[PDB]
């Protein structure tokens, strides 16, 4: 093949090379144009899933994909950290939160997921992988009236996230510091696995041990050209589970959301 996007990706990657192994040192505002370049390709609806796979699975694309993935995960984390601190210090925390670069995408993503998971008010949700800015947990309660535990493995990040939640005056959202294994001691209707919850294999194998066959489990992943952003959940990762529904993203939303149940 001979896709125009091949060269475009290689060119973007060449301008990321000199940041390799040091993407966490990036200036957030300064690198936004790079994210736009990457997302122009990711979000191009004329790229079919077969063509995307052709490009992204090619051995010659491996280093470029690695550069772009490192950039993406580092920019995302830094954007969250920065916004979390801004929200905590703000006189108008909800207005500050609504200005988050990704805020409108999260509203759409969650709308997708609430249909997929048939969320009902008063249901109990657990979200694995909260991060500094636990927006999903927040929305699950604020919009969907669910009762929520957010799980975050890094104690300092967990503490920051609590301050965001409390700053906003949001009720019914608690953060538990721990790994995915903390769900053993919880009772819940819906389990959600962050796009960035890692490592996938260990996480899903642990989840399998705790849930029953009725637990609605939604996990976030990347499909099509959006897989340029981050490594997709693999088939091996979800062994012992059956897929029951998917929402493929549109517009600027990055994640595909997948509903699974523990076998049988």
Ligand X SMILES: CSC[C@H]1O[C@@H](n2cnc3c(N)ncnc32)[C@H](O)[C@@H]1O
Instruction: Rule CB under 6 A: say whether 160 interacts with ligand X.
Output: no
Give the C-alpha separation, 96 to 123, whole Å. Answer: 28
- CB-nearest residue to ligand X: 131
CB 209 within 8 A of CB 244: no
Pairing type for strands 216-221 and 256-262 reads: antiparallel
CB 255 within 8 A of CB 220: yes
CB 216 within 8 A of CB 245: no
Residues in the chain: 264
Q: Which is nearer to ligand TNA, 61 or 228 (CB)?
A: 228
- Residue 153 marked as a ligand binder: yes
The nearest distance, CB 202 to ligand X, in angstroms, is 7
Q: Which of 93, 131, 172, 224 binds ligand TNA (CB under 6 A)?
A: 131
CB 192 within 8 A of CB 218: yes
Instruction: Rule CB under 6 A: say whether 109 interacts with ligand TNA.
Output: yes
- Residue 180 marked as a ligand binder: yes
Whose structure tokens read 């523990």?
262
254 interface partner picked from Br ion, ligand TNA, ligand X, none, CB below 5 to 8 A per type: ligand TNA
Q: Which of 13, 68, 127, 129 binds ligand X (CB under 6 A)?
A: 129
The tokens describing 108, both together, are 């759409």
- Residue 152 marked as a ligand binder: yes
Q: Which is nearer to its own copies, 163 or 262 (CB)?
A: 262
Q: Which is nearer to its own copies, 73 or 238 (CB)?
A: 238
x/- binding map, residues 220-249, to its own copies, per CB under 8 A? ---x-----------x--xxxxxxxxx-x-
Instruction: List Cβ neighbours of 153 (8 Å cut-off, separation of 6 or more).
Output: 129, 177, 178, 179
Q: Which is nearer to ligand X, 113 or 152 (CB)?
A: 152
33 interface partner picked from Br ion, its own copies, ligand TNA, none, CB below 5 to 8 A per type: Br ion
Give the C-alpha separation, 143 to 209, whole Å. Answer: 30
179 interface partner picked from ligand TNA, Br ion, ligand X, none, CB below 5 to 8 A per type: ligand X
User: Residue numbers of the site for Br ion (CB under 5 A)?
Assistant: 33, 92, 94-95
Q: What is the DSSP string of 57-93?
A: H-GGGHHHHHHHHHHHHHHHHHHHHHHHHHHHH-SSH
Question: Where on the chain is the footprint of its own copies (CB under 8 A)?
Answer: 1-3, 46, 48-51, 53-54, 223, 235, 238-246, 248, 263-264
Binding-site residue set: 106, 136, 152-153, 180, 198
């Amino acid at each position: 093949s001979c896709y125009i996007y091949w060269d475009k990706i290689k060119r973007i990657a060449s301008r990321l090379e000199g940041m390799n192994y040091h993407f966490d040192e990036m200036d957030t505002s300064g690198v936004m144009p790079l994210l736009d370049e990457i997302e122009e390709i990711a979000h191009d609806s004329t790229i079919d899933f077969e063509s995307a796979k052709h490009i992204l699975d090619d051995a010659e694309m491996n280093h470029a994909l690695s550069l772009i993935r490192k950039f993406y995960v580092n920019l995302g984390m830094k954007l969250e950290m920065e916004k979390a601190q801004e929200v905590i210090e703000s006189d108008s925390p909800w207005e500050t939160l609504r200005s988050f670069y990704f805020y409108p995408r999260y509203l759409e993503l969650l709308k997708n997921e609430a249909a997929l998971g048939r969320f009902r008010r008063g249901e109990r949700a657990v979200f694995i992988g909260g991060g500094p800015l636990p927006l999903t947990g927040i929305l699950l309660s604020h919009v969907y009236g669910m009762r929520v535990n957010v799980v975050e493995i890094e104690p300092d990040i967990a503490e920051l996230s609590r301050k965001v939640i409390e700053g906003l005056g949001v009720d019914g959202v608690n953060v538990i510091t721990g790994d995915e294994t903390v769900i053993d001691g919880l009772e819940f209707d819906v389990l959600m696995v962050a796009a960035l919850a890692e490592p996938k294999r260990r996480v899903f194998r642990n989840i399998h041990r705790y849930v029953d066959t009725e637990t609605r489990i939604i996990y976030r992943t990347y499909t099509g050209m959006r897989a340029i952003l981050y490594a997709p959940v693999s088939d091996d990762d979800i062994t012992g589970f059956r897929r029951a529904g998917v929402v493929l993203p549109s517009g600027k939303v990055n994640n595909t959301s997948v509903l699974v149940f523990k076998c049988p």
